[PDB]
Amino acid sequence: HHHHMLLTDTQEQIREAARDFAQERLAPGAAARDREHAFPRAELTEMGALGFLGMLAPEEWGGSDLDMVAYALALEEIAAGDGACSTIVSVHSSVGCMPILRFGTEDQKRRFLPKMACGEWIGGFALTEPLKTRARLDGDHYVIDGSKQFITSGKNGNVVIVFAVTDPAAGKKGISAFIVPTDTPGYEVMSVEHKLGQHSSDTCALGFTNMRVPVENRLGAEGEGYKIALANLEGGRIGIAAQAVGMARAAFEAARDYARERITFGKPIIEHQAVAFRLADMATRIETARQMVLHAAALREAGKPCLTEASMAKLVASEMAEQVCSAAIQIHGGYGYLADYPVERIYRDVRVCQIYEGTSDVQRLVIARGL
Template sequence: NCPVNAILMRYGNAAQKKQWLTPLAQGDMLGVFCLTEPHVGSDASSLRTTAVKEGDAYVINGVKQFITSGKNGHAAVVIAVTDKGAGKKGMSAFMVPTSAPGYVVARLEDKLGQHSSDTAQINFDNCRIPADNLIGAEGEGYKIALGALEGGRIGIAAQSVGMARSAFEFALGYAKERQSFGTAIFNHQAVGFRLADCATRLEAARQLIWHAATLRDAGLPCLKEAAMAKLFASEMAEEVCSAAIQTLGGYGYVSDFPVERIYRDVRVCQIYEGTSDVQKIIIQRAL
């Protein structure tokens, strides 16, 4: 929902905000962000999905991959090529209702984690939408997509911290109750220091997120800060969840306890909205 809302808030016209943003913000609709394609992950400038203007409509054709809420969502922002010879400046953004003819859910992915959220491959087969569904102007799609990802990365960082904190708190509670060698395992330095490291890394990630979010709320550039927050928080989260499993021992590895699920859920945070490698490229370029 967040990338779609952010795009409409910044680039949508009054009619689009009334039609789409209001129900999205109220929770009556679920947004879908369609950028990634089967052959295009990190290189968003190489899209093949096209949108051809025909009279008072655009006709969209192509395939989008790994689309969150692609099946259960209601309103999709689709980034497509409108001018094949213009490179990044030939991409445009469109609002597409998922009920539109030609919006086809081709496949649902069987994932390691995050099973409560569907991830789909979407085929656009002569999907015709009104020309009024163009967001901003033609040629602004790449800029619109990158702007949404900047804010989205802060959100993924926060998601990472939330999941890691849940696993940490469960492990901490377990460590203070579980007895070994006549005392709670928390009192054994190996376990206590492990959890101390987790608490420190969680707090460091939170501060990176607050800093990036403060800049974005103020309308200031935060591309580097958002990338730093996502990079650190997502990698920290996997490490903290792994430490939580280790603290529970065998119980951490079975589904009777939540930490194994959280570990599976958090792993994708290093992948979507830009991989860790992409975040490092962004940070490097900003130095």
């Protein structure tokens, strides 16, 4: 019999499969993709063949249809190999694929989900603005004019869910969602931002000018945009929480290894008390955050309310990860500040986990409302 509150063998197998892939195929190029700001298209293609871009899609659409706990385990492994890659996957899965799955017509799902589930088409989500973006009905097309900011995969993605006002008098009831191929004429990347880290993943400002979108690409009814925009808060926040755990873990393992190789020289790490206790604290914080992330994922999988718990997980893991990554740098001494070791990059990569997908204060606000 399966032990209560322990991972199933299938969940452990998925974790190991994600680990094997991330370590063998993502980690060796992670530093280079950081230096080059290079989108991991080749690696995403590989991942797609192995089911890692279809984890939240059902099998009938080409997905691997994982439970939410397994999905979190997989994202953690991917993040421990390459942080930016885990961002691209989390966004793709939770707010690229899921809105089309839940709100799409059968024909919209046929047209978009198989190529998204195998990772051929990478999905993005364009809600946030510098809503002023609007969509005007013109016969068999909507005409979209506006702009978006901080859009992950706005340039390298193939399909982006665009949110635009269709009735300015209806306020939050007057927004609609649109499935927009990124090669639609009038779709424009205004900028790819230079960031502190996760260089490999494009974060974009978009402009839409006279951008004609077929009425058959409207996701849901006119006015359903607000509901659609909020439909995956939990999945997204769980995913970013998992990636923060993964990056923290990678930095911890680097620091543990450096301690054994370069501080104690093979002797028990416990022989250097301060460094041993610091590593113990790091391990404890990582494990504790992980259990919060998996708890939230378990609630989501069961369809229970979990906005509070997902937000808690995202908050506690993102803040944990900066502390652990910084301690990983300290343990490396002078080498911690050098690009030759991975912990300075992981530090840079992880800092944005407290900022996107709801800033920490946005998380606190929803947690406070649900007390």
